[PDB]
Structures are given as structure tokens and as C-alpha cells.
Subunit: 363 residues, 4 copies
């Protein structure tokens, strides 16, 4: 083939630096990028109305937690709206995030759409005018993006077509962002739904990740200037067979070692329905795994960092402190987990948990 | 692989019928789908202002030509705007088109965007919410769509990446339309620019078309419910070597016979910068070619059906008749061409022409 | 991509001519290329010993049938051994075949080998020194070759890997033969085993053929200088649902029309276990099918042309005449079938049969 | 996709162990697998006759070097013939190799063959009955194999077709060996010929390696039970621009970090025409490179370990000692190089050399 560089050494340096800061040792990402539709089902759980102010107050609640949270959070994924909101102190949220030593990210996909002649499979859209949107977001302080593709395991679910099509769109999205100085987080999520065991998930995860990096290559994206946000290798939510945390940890790092090139700056796992505690224990075990792990293995959790905080808050402005405390707890635990230093459960074996939040999806 | 039908026998029948009527013997397509930006450079050639009324009047000029034009035009490709305009008689344009026995089409792509780490190569966007747009257009009377991808020949131009990426997006676009009862016209256009000869264009056209039908297959689209709008195989506009019309005709039908399955209802060629006359002569020779041609070989011209009409009109409402006459001339000639009955030049050999309209592109 | 011609116009002409003669109207191919292992199970059915002389006598029996057989047989596929044998009259068999207006072919693959990490799937080998072998066979009078790949339908049988791998090896084999002036018969056979219905076979056949022509394209083979030897689209041998001959005929020509380019000189079907009579009736119906069939639709049968002859012979030299008569019967019937003129059953509908010969395979 | 394991945990363990011993810290591989044709041009350089005894004596010369060589050589690649020869002491060569703590390997490909419609490109054959040959070699003491594919850089040389085809055959070869308990060394060699610079070689090497691991994945081979034998990233032999050893070292480990998964046990570089000394200095610098290198970076040299020894020997049995001394020198240097401990030149920068041996190829 032939060489026409996509990025200049200058643009390349820039992308590597951002990618590296987000995933610095002990750090992870807060994914607070629920669209108004999904946060609605959250706010609604605590009988609170889904109003812009309520959404703005809760995002603030999370984003203005005390400084114990600073060394733990490398980046925060925001929804478009929140990226233009302000804290009570009149500071735009990207400002409060940065001031606390965090990098701000923005979700840029426009949801999943059905794949015709498939068994309920899906791609995701959002490429139209993505370049323009990325240049603006860059101007407005965001340094990394998020695009989520969804795969599922069924009798004939991860259809090649889905694998090929999803891998290719992740590559297109990645290419566009890099051109605008935004570090793409590539999120090929294989859903925990179904009663498949550990090994079926590992096999499927390995086949999917292989396709994804080949696509990324074809499309010529600069790996060092990217993050990977896979699912951990776990049994299906309906599988009756039990597995320990090092069974899932071993399965996860193996799958990862066989597919993602060492040049990938880091992989930030999604929790997919796991309880806050269970999600921490698995991240820890992953980091305790004996095998050589050439990339940062950290977190990029949403509800796994938010369940207890939301529930503590319960819409009452009066519970702000108690809520923020619940979130800081989690942030600390996950900063420990992503270092294999998580003190409770989690350790080159384990098998604890207890909390729970999943739905026909996973997460 | 595994069977999950994309279309029902009912939806399949529907798509075949529409595809077949558009390309019935003696018929072709008027591509009158210039966006406001390109028609602007047209109107401007005849020192007329680019106003909605002027655009509406000129579209009307073409669309209300006398009934001699009815057996010649199977379909008309409209731009979004015109699809919602009315003729002086208060009739929506889709209505005047249909009443004259034509099927109305709508251009649905949102232009080309650069491919990073490529030599000025491009894909095209417009997939975002394409399903929704297609359902509406269907409601509003359109039965087929148009999406144009652009490839170019250079020292290293038709890069696989471009070929693969463009082929795949044509397949995605095709899949979505078929799901909404719209017959997709697949337009992989290889640009006439460069000083390449006949054979380089044939080779490249063969490689591109092969990729396109494989993609179409992977994506499971129903071929019978599609039209192909390729370029004819011609030397580059800058090639100093001369070729006869059967040299290009032979080169064109060969390239086509090696790549597009007989199940494809018909191929409607683009003129790409050829004069009205030259475009007619080549279409005719193509239809005079001795080889077995299992699909309709017809036209889907824009400026090759409009040059003389536009120039006759020259903005003066007074020249309406003289202008419409110029267009009807062309329509007749092309109805003859697509039957190998075109009486002037054009015939299993030929080499005439004379008119001219191309620019860094081709067309 | 880039142009480095594989074949010269001279080599191209040559390949087209051979391909066209084999499949001239009314003609088909006798596949008499059983290896010593399979003919052994044949000879053994009629309690005759598998000796070189017995094999040579029986091949002779077939190859020296009276002149009524001449306009019916365009080519004969021979096994390596027979290609070097002589008829009683001291004439090398390639000589008696040619003198009777037939083209001689040679099987050049070296059987199937297992595909690792697959459900009993297989490729086929024989590429090693294939070029050398082809140059010799060419010298020794053979003008076309045969290479058979085998695919099967199971809960997860036509695995992409098998499809991709088999398609690619067919392309490699095809490329080598064309370089040595031998017209490759490409044989992607999907086995009749399993209880799948008509539609599952059609879907699978369509997916396989699509892959095969894409591969062929990638590998740059000259289509016009090739023959295709697919399976007809039929239900599985274990399917309890009944289908008429036009159901299978319709299913077959549809599948074919969607996948193989009109440039392919002809498709010579394998019988795969069908009785001599049933095989004739299906070929006929196929040729009676109302749809446009741009290529020769003929036969390339083995046991479907030989069952009755072998059984008539029964090892006795005394029954030579009665045996040859049985074969000539079949040859005539199939010459009629491949013209849609087969007078008994077979006709744009039908549903007759009665004879039988299949085994864990199909054929 | 779907899970049908290729290897059992037992077979998997076995392959990992062998792979790991060959490439243990400080160890490398002696590639002494010249076919009779190439060793002939060697023996001939020192005006010695190419007789079985002369070939047997010289192989012995290398294989019976004193014990200083034992910790340095993890494996030895032998040609078929030598695998069945004996040392003067009546010991089969696989025995003397093993007794000295080495693993014996066997070259199993049958050379390169032209790719039709390509610019002098090539695949390699040797798959026919490869399984059988591998089972025998296993019985006869070999534990790893070698298969070499050759790619070249030209105006349009690394044609996709070549890349795809070569990658696929490496995967087929790898699959077969693993099934027979033999650790495949995968050798996609991009030839040093041409006047291309460092960056063109890096780009091409990155594109080739990406294709190779995707193929390997598709074919389901077990990475941990494999070795990679790439070329270092260097300018073309005809490039007039100069580069330092860390320029080539940096270029090499970057290219490697972007493409080969950390699960690959180790990469054993080929010298490709570099002098013994230059080859050592580059290996060292590679190991001195600041970047994270998750796999063993060692040597698998032929003439780069043999030049001086052969020349010292000069056919005279009398010079046995002086010759073996020259080889032991090199072995030691390379054991140091592959540890970044090579004491002369070589160090996170350098730019020395001086010796020379390349020909229209590279090596």
C-alpha cells in the first residue's frame, strides 16, 4: 500500500499526551453521558422530575465532589447538554472538570439502528457532520470522544455482518475525531444478555476485538491516540454456572492479550450491569492477574460509580454531601482496583459482589 | 451463514416492479437533482439569479415538456426542495411527473467527505436518520433514491480503502432504502479526470464494481430491487490517445459483463462531462455492442439532457417553448440511443461528438 | 489497483474457445474421473475386482460408445491414470475422446483435508507443483481441469472460514491452470446431507457463490475462460418436506442469477446422489425456467450417467453392448434436458424421479 | 462466530512451552536450513564441492561447537536432509542439538511460486501433505517449523493480493503444524531490495503484519504457540539516505508495537543481507529501545552467524577449530545483542557495521 500520512508528528504527539493523561496510574473515567432519555429513568427511580435543572444539579453533584476524587478521575464523559451547563458558582462544567485535573470527553454517537436481515442486530449512527461537531467540541474544551457499538451473543447473534459493519463504523468515527485533535474511545460492547458461559464470551470477545483492530488498521488510525472500552469477559446474566473473579479476570486479560496491540495506550472497561462493588472487585482481580499486561487496565464506569450517590441524593438538595460522599467512596475504590490495590475483596482469585443494576441490554 | 429475511415477498415484489418500470424499453431517467449550490453555477452561466422561483421555473420548464417526452422518461431524480414545489397550475411536481407516466426519485446523500491518509480520496455521508427521511419521501410520492460515491484514477488513487469504504456505504444506503420501499440507485462514479487510457479505466471500473456487488451481497440487499449508475468506460479527459465509440462501447459492456450479476434490473449510465450528442452516441453504440447484455442499458443524465435547454431558455420566460423543445430533442435521441436505434452517429463502431461540459470532477 | 495482465489476448482467446466448445448447445460433460478408491466401491457393487485392466475396460466401455453420443458430450473428465491408458485398438484414450469431437479434462485436486477448529469442515489440497502438472497434462492432450471443494450445511456448518478458505483455494487453482492454457472448472459443492429445506440451500448457495466470484476477481482470473460446476438448489436428503422440480429449478436459477456474472461461459451441474432420471428431469426444468439465463445450463455428471451402464455391464465382457446402450440412453436424455427438450418428465413444473445413489457426502 | 476448539489445553500447553524455551532470555536460533541449491553457492564461494559429505561436515562444524554456544542457541533450523544425518560420533544431528540444550526445527515450505497478473510477486507452496510430513518430523525429533513468504517494495509491489494471499498461506501452514505439536515460525519477509527509505519500509511492514495477524486469527491459530520472524525496518539497499541504528531500532519496535499482539511469545529477526556485525548492532539497539517490548526480541540468523565460520573453514578439515571459533564468536555477540548487552557498537543510538552479504533477494 501507500503512505499519505493521516496525522502530522505534531498532531500525533498531541493525541498521545491526552490519551496518556486520562489513563495515568490510579486514574479512570467517570462516564456521566446519559442522554436525557436514560437519565430520565434514573431520576425517576428516586421519584424526581427529569428537568434540565435537576439534571444539571445532579451532574454538578458528581462533578464538584471534594478533592479526594481528583487523583482518581483522569477524564469525564459528558453528554452534549452538560458540556454547555454551568455550576452554581457560574463556572462552565468543562472548567470545573479541568480545574480538578480531569480531561473532558463528549459522547458523539447518535444511537444504534437495526441491521436488516439480521437477528435484531444493530450498528450505530452519528457520522454525519461528525467532523464539524468534533471541531466545535474541541474549541469548547473536550479532548476525547465516545462512540458505542453494541454486539450480542445468541444462537446466531454475533453475525459477521454485525462484526464487520460495527468494526468499520468504529474506525470511521475514530478517523474523524483524530483529524480534529480528539482522542477516540473505541467501545465495541458485547452485551451480557443470554445464558452463555465464560468461554463463549471470551471466544466472541476475541473474534470481535480482532476485527476491530484490523478495521482500525485499514482505516489507518493512530492507535497510541486511542482508548479501548471493552466489556470484561463474564458469563451471561442468565448462565446458571458460577465463576470466580479470577476466572473472569484470567478470561479477560487472555482475550485482551491475544487481540489488542501493545501500542494501545489503555483499556477502560465498562461495568455492564455489575454492581458498584462487583465491578471494583473484577477490575482489581484483572490488575492482579499474573500475565504481562502492556496497557493501562482501568475503569470507565457510569452507574457503577453512581448507584449509591443517586440513591443517597434522592432528589433532596439537603443530601448533597451524603451523596457526594457515596460517589467519592466508589471513585477511591476504583482508583485502588485499577492498581490491584483494592483492599476489600478483589485479588488474584476472589468471588464476592452484592448491589445490582442491569436491563435488556447490560448496564 | 444464516437466514433472517431482510424483505418479505410482498416488499420484494414491490421493489422489482418499481425498478422495472423506470427502466422499461425506450425509457431512461432525467437527473434534475442539482443542489442549490450546483444549479447556481448553471443559472449563473445564463446570467440569471439563483432564486427559489428561478429554480422552480426551470425545473418546471423540464418537467412540463410536451407528451413526446412521456415514453422516453421512466423516472426523474429530484432534489429535496423541488420535491415540495408546485407547477404554475398548482400541482405538486411529483404529481406532474407521475401524471406523465414517470416515477419520481430523490437524491438522499449529503455530499462527499475526505478520507484521512489518502490522496484526496473521499466517501460520502448522509446515512444519519436516512430511514426516517426515506419513509417520509415515500409518503410524499418518491419511489427511488440516489446516492453518489466518487472514485478517481491517479498514480495511487483508487486506493483499496476508498474502494472498500465507498462500496460499503453504498450497501448501507441501499439496505436502508429497500426497508422503506425505495429502490436504491447505486452510483459508484469513477471520475474521467487524469490522462489514463481506456484500458486503465476498464480495469479500475472492473475492480470497483466487483467490490460493490460483494458488499451489496454481504449487506444482503435484494439486487432485483436496485439500479446501477456507473460511468461508461472512457479514456481520461487528459489522455492524448484517441478511441472510437465502439472501442469505448466494447470496453464498457465487457467491464459490465464481468462484474454485475444478471439479476440487476438495469444500469443507467451517467454522462460525466460528455456533450449531449457524444453521450447519446456512446449509449447507442453500447446497445449496438454484439455481446449478450442481460440488463437494461439506458441513461440517467443531468447536464447531457439539459445543456441546450438551459442555453435556449437563458432566463427569459419568453423562450420557454424553444427551451423545452431542446430538451425534448435530447430525450428522444436518448430514447433511441438506449435502443441502439439512435439514427445519427452511434452504431457498432462510430466516433463522432461536439458540445462539451466537464470540470475537476467530471460532469 | 493496478494492471499487470495475467493473460495475453492470445491466451485469452484460447481459453474462451475451449470453454465454449465444451458447453456448445446440446452438449455436456461425462465426469469419469473417479480415483481408484471410489471406482473400487463401484466395481465392487457388481462383484468385479478393482484391477487396472477392469478399470481400463470399463472406461473404454464408456469412451467408445457409438456416435449417437458424439453431439451430446462436449468434454470428459478423466482421472490421471486413464489419461495414459489405451483402447484395445491401441489408441490412447485422449485420442478416442477427441476423435469423437470431445475435449478431454483432468481432475487435478488431491482430495479434501480437515479445517482445524471447525465442525468437520474441509478445504482441498493439490496446489503443490500444480503448474508443472498442468503443463504436462496440456502436452498430453487435456484442455480443462477439475478441482472440487466441499461445503456442508449444519447448525453452524458453512462457517465463513470454510467459505473464505475454499473460495480462495478455488481461485488459486483457477489462476494456475489458466496460465498453462487449461480451462478450470470451478466446483464449490454444497453437500445435500442434512434435513434442511430448499430455501436454506438457496441462501447458503447464494452466499457461497458470492464469495467464490469475489475471490476469483481478487485473484484476477479470466471468467470467460472458466466453467462453474455448482450443485442444484435442492432440499437436504433428510428433509421431510416435498418440493416439485420447478420449485427446485426456480430456486436454482434464482440463486445463480444473483451471483454468477454473465461473462461465465457456462455452468455444468453435478448430480449429487440424484438418480439418473431425477437428474435429467431437474436439468430440463432448469432450462425450462422462464427467467433470463445468460449462460449455458448443462450437465457434468458422473454416476448419473453411469449407474445403469455399470449395472448392465456387471463385469461381463459379453454385456459390453447392452451396457454402452444404457449410457447412450442417458447421454441422449441429458442432451435433451440441457435444452429443455427432455421429452419424459421435466418441464416448467414437474415432480417425477426413481433410481437412487447417495452416501455421507452426496453423489 | 462459533467455538470448536482447534487445540486442547494439553496441546496448547505443549506448544507454549516449546515456543518459550526456544526464545528463553539470552537465546536465539541458528537457521542452518539452506537447501542443497543455496548451500551450493556457499560451498562454492570457498572453492569446495557441494557433496553430501561436505554439507554434512560443515553442518557438523556448526552443530558441534563447544559448550560456550549452549546458553546462546535456543533452537536450530535444519533442512530436511541434515535432519537425517549423523555426526562423526554416530549421533543423529537432532541428538547432538538437543544434548546441547537446543530445540530442533525443520524448514517445511517448498519455495516461492509466481503470482499471476502481478509485478513479479510471489506466494510460497508446500501445504500438500504438510500434515503427514509434520507428524513424521515430530516423531523424528523436530519441535518447530519454518515457512518463508516473500514480499517486496516497488512502485506498486506489496500488492494487496500478495499481502492477502501470503498472509493466508502463512495461516494455513501455521494451523497444520500446531495440529501436529509443532510450533510454527511465521516468516513474512519484506525484501530489503529497492531504494526506499526507512519510513516506506515501516509503513509497508505495518500493513503486512496487520494482515498476517488478522489472517492468523481467522484461521484460529494459537498465538502463544508461535514465533514471528520478520525483517527489521531498514532503508532499501539502494537508498542513498543514511540512518542510525536507533533510527532503524525505533522504526522497528514502533512497527512491531502497532501490529503484533503481546500474546506472541517472541519475534526472531532475519538478518537479510546485513553483515554479521551490523546484524548484531541492530539487534542490540532494538533491545536498548526505550519503548515497552512485551515479547522476546531475538535472532534467527543464517549467513549472519555463518559468514566468518565458512570463510575460516575454507573446505579444509584442518581449520575446523578456527572456524567453530568464528561461529562461537557470533553466537556470543548475538546472545549479548538480544539482551541489549552487546558490548561493542549497538546502544540506544549507534551507527557502525562492516562485513556484507546480499543478492536480488536480501540475505
Amino acid at each position: 500500500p501507500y503512505q499519505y500520512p493521516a496525522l502530522t508528528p505534531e498532531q500525533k504527539k498531541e493525541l498521545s499526551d491526552i490519551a496518556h493523561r486520562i489513563v495515568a496510574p490510579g486514574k479512570g473515567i467517570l462516564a456521566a453521558d446519559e442522554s436525557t432519555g436514560s437519565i430520565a429513568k434514573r431520576l425517576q427511580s428516586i421519584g424526581t422530575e427529569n428537568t434540565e435543572e435537576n439534571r444539571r444539579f445532579y451532574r454538578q453533584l458528581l462533578l464538584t465532589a471534594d478533592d479526594r476524587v481528583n487523583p482518581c478521575i483522569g477524564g469525564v464523559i459528558l453528554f452534549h447538554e452538560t458540556l454547555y451547563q454551568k455550576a452554581d458558582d457560574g463556572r462552565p462544567f468543562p472548567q470545573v472538570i479541568k480545574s480538578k485535573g480531569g480531561v473532558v470527553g463528549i459522547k458523539v454517537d447518535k444511537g444504534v439502528v437495526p441491521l436488516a436481515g439480521t437477528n435484531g442486530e444493530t450498528t450505530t449512527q452519528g457520522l454525519d457532520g461528525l467532523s464539524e461537531r468534533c471541531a466545535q467540541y474541541k474549541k469548547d474544551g473536550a479532548d476525547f470522544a465516545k462512540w458505542r457499538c453494541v454486539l450480542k451473543i445468541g444462537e446466531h447473534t454475533p453475525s459477521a455482518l454485525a462484526i464487520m459493519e460495527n468494526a468499520n463504523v468504529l474506525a470511521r468515527y475514530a478517523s474523524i475525531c483524530q483529524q480534529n485533535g480528539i482522542v477516540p474511545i473505541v467501545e465495541p460492547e458485547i452485551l451480557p444478555d443470554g445464558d452463555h458461559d465464560l468461554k463463549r464470551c471470551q471466544y466472541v470477545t476475541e473474534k470481535v476485538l480482532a476485527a476491530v483492530y484490523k478495521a482500525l488498521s485499514d482505516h489507518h488510525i493512530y492507535l497510541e491516540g486511542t482508548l479501548l472500552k471493552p466489556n470484561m469477559v463474564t458469563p451471561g446474566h442468565a448462565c446458571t454456572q458460577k465463576f470466580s473473579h479470577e476466572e473472569i479476570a484470567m478470561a479477560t486479560v487472555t482475550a485482551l492479550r491475544r487481540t489488542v496491540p501493545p501500542a494501545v495506550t489503555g483499556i477502560t472497561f465498562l461495568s455492564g450491569g455489575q454492581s458498584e462493588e462487583e465491578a471494583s472487585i473484577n477490575l482489581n482481580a484483572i490488575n492482579k492477574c499474573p500475565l504481562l499486561k502492556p496497557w493501562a487496565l482501568t475503569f470507565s464506569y457510569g452507574r457503577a460509580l453512581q448507584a449509591s450517590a443517586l440513591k443517597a441524593w434522592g432528589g433532596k438538595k439537603e443530601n448533597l454531601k451524603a451523596a457526594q460522599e457515596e460517589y467519592v467512596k466508589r471513585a477511591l475504590a476504583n482508583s485502588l482496583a485499577c492498581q490491584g490495590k483494592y483492599t476489600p475483596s478483589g485479588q488474584a482469585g476472589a468471588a464476592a459482589s452484592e448491589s445490582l443494576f442491569v436491563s435488556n441490554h447490560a448496564y
